[PDB]
Amino acid sequence: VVSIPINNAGFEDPFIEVVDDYTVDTPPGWTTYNPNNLVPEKRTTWTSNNGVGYVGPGTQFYNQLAPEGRNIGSIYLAQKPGSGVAGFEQILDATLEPDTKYTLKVDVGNFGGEFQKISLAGFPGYRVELLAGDTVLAADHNNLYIKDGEFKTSTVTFTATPDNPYLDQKLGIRLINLLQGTFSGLDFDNVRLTVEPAQ
Amino acid sequence: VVSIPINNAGFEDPFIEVVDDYTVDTPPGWTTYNPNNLVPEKRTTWTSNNGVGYVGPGTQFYNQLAPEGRNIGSIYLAQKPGSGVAGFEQILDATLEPDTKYTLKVDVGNFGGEFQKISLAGFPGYRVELLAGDTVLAADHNNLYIKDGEFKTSTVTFTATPDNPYLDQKLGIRLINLLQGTFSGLDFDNVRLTVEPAQ
Ligand SMILES: [Ca+2]
Ligand SMILES: [Ca+2]
Ligand SMILES: [Ca+2]
Ligand SMILES: [Ca+2]
């Protein structure tokens, strides 16, 4: 079992000093997945946005600390449920290889609390995707039940055979806000991708 | 734990007498999910199609018999990988209810063998979806590795909270050929949907 390197896999860049502080710009090492043009190029607190946030002692958002390190990665969509999806994408340098089983793990957070008198209860749903090239090889579309204030680990697996059409294409990861409920924000942390011989 | 009734949930209708025989028309109780217009209204052996097939002693397709009963449900797509998706859909009379955990199970088959000198080795990928109204609540996009000649059970879970936007909409099930590999056909059997109080 070997790890595949991922840039800023725990959203630890940038460092954030103050409890419950956050950014509203795409985290370093990631791009914004924006198939429905829901997230604007220039973001502020109340536009749809993504960014990083510090989860440490003092936090109103969780009954635990960040799954890894200090920070999580966050995606907020202000449009009504049903309007589309958005999130994080990263294309890796590793390529799809035959007779290999890929295991993608990421922690998904349903933050609770209240922000400027707006309840953060509720959840939009999530999807975690493993890609080769432009193809979604395997995905967890919203299978875990995550209560307000907790994280759960999503696991996505895929086995590439020697006849897979997408061998030698670049691997990729997407972490998606489904916008299928309110409050329509969620967090991700601790992205891990490992490889092993196929079963 | 209570079962939700599904029509023709094991594809046992119509009865098929002869080993490895099949139909090419939408199974009773189901509709054809056809978002990319890949499946024609009138089907024959070599068009894209769906239907039912008998898997019994004598079969070339599996190292086991049908997971349930005599028959499976099958979807073949003749277009090149990447062209889109198609499969089975059924809208149920049950509606989405709050504080309830849904468990959707279906057996997914990767048939092997050879048909008219064409190898059936390889697999297109699958997705199993649980719906309310037009919304995919939860889905297993291709997480199981299924070798030629075997079936594996896919499990999809979803918990509906009292604030879910889709409460009171009709539940639905989709069983999808992803068309992400060749030979681009697969089978499904033994659709089961159960309900229980939320965790
Ligand atoms: Ca982290
Ligand atoms: Ca929440
Ligand atoms: Ca059956
Ligand atoms: Ca096959």
Using CA atoms, how far apart are residues B39 and B33, in angstroms rounded to an integer?
9
Using CA atoms, how far apart are residues A148 and A114, in angstroms rounded to an integer?
11
- CA-wise closest residue to B4 among B78, B91, B70: B91
Binding-site entries of A? 10, 12, 21-22, 41, 68, 71, 110-111, 120, 122, 134, 148, 151, 189
Ligand nearest to the CA of A121: 2
Considering only the beta carbons, identify the residue of A135, A145, A157 that sits closest to B199: A145
Q: Quick check: B88 and B186 in contact, CB under 8 A?
A: no
Q: Quick check: B6 and B190 in contact, CB under 8 A?
A: no
Give the burial class of A1: count Cβ atoms within 10 A of its Cβ; 0-12 exposed, 13-18 middle, 19 or more buried: exposed
The residue with tokens 């024959």 is B44
In this complex, is the C-beta atom of A33 within 8 Å of any C-beta atom belonging to chain B? Answer: no
The CA distances from residue A194 to A115, A126, A149, in Å, are: 37, 21, 28
Is B140's CB within 8 Å of A143's CB? yes
Asked if the bond preceding B183 is cis, omega within 30° of 0, the reply is yes
In this complex, is the C-beta atom of B157 within 8 Å of any C-beta atom belonging to chain A? Answer: yes
Give me the count of residues in chain A: 199
Domain count, chain A: 1
Q: Quick check: B180 and B121 in contact, CB under 8 A?
A: no
In this complex, is the C-beta atom of A108 within 8 Å of any C-beta atom belonging to chain B? Answer: no
Using CA atoms, how far apart are residues B137 and B129, in angstroms rounded to an integer?
8
- CA-wise closest residue to B87 among B23, B175, B173, B6: B175
Using CA atoms, how far apart are residues A104 and B107, in angstroms rounded to an integer?
23
Using CA atoms, how far apart are residues B172 and B192, in angstroms rounded to an integer?
12
Using CA atoms, how far apart are residues B86 and B91, in angstroms rounded to an integer?
16
What residues form DSSP beta bridges with B131? B136, B172
The residue with tokens 């395997």 is A138
Give the burial class of A147: count Cβ atoms within 10 A of its Cβ; 0-12 exposed, 13-18 middle, 19 or more buried: middle
Half-sphere exposure in the Cβ direction for A182 (13 Å, CA): 10
Using CA atoms, how far apart are residues A139 and B156, in angstroms rounded to an integer?
12
Q: What is the extent of the structural domain holding B103?
A: 1-199
Q: Quick check: A88 and A131 in contact, CB under 8 A?
A: no
- CA-wise closest residue to B69 among B38, B103, B101, B27: B27
Q: Quick check: A113 and A60 in contact, CB under 8 A?
A: yes
Using CA atoms, how far apart are residues A193 and B181, in angstroms rounded to an integer?
23
Is B180's CB within 8 Å of A156's CB? no
In this complex, is the C-beta atom of A136 within 8 Å of any C-beta atom belonging to chain B? Answer: yes
Q: Which of chain A's residues have a Cβ under 8 Å away from the Cβ of B136?
A: 141-142
> Which distant-in-sequence residues (6+ apart) come within 8 Å of A178 by Cβ?
A85, A124, A125, A126, A127, A141, A142
> Which distant-in-sequence residues (6+ apart) come within 8 Å of B190 by Cβ?
B9, B10, B67, B68, B105, B106, B107
Three-state SS letters, chain B = CEECCCCCCCCCCCCCCCCCCECCCCCCCCEEECCCCCCCCCCCCCCCEEEEEECCCCCCCCCCCCCCCCEEEEEECCCCCCCCCEEEEEEEEEECCCCEEEEEEEEEEECCCEECCEECCCCCCEEEEEEECCEEEEEEECCCCCCCCEEEEEEEEEEECCCCCCCCCEEEEEEEECCCCCCCEEEEEEEEEEEEECC
Using CA atoms, how far apart are residues B162 and B149, in angstroms rounded to an integer?
43
Q: Which of chain A's residues have a Cβ under 8 Å away from the Cβ of B126?
A: none
Resolution value, angstrom units: 1.4
What does residue A86 show for φ and ψ, rounded to 5 degrees?
-165, 165
In this complex, is the C-beta atom of A138 within 8 Å of any C-beta atom belonging to chain B? Answer: yes
Which tokens in the block code for residue B158? 């979803």
The residue with tokens 């449900």 is B73
- CA-wise closest residue to A165 among B48, B101, B80: B80
Q: What is the DSSP letter of A22?
A: B
DSSP three-state, residue A189:
strand
Q: Quick check: A190 and A10 in contact, CB under 8 A?
A: yes
Q: Quick check: A190 and A9 in contact, CB under 8 A?
A: yes
Q: How many A from CA of B72 to the centre of ligand 3?
A: 5
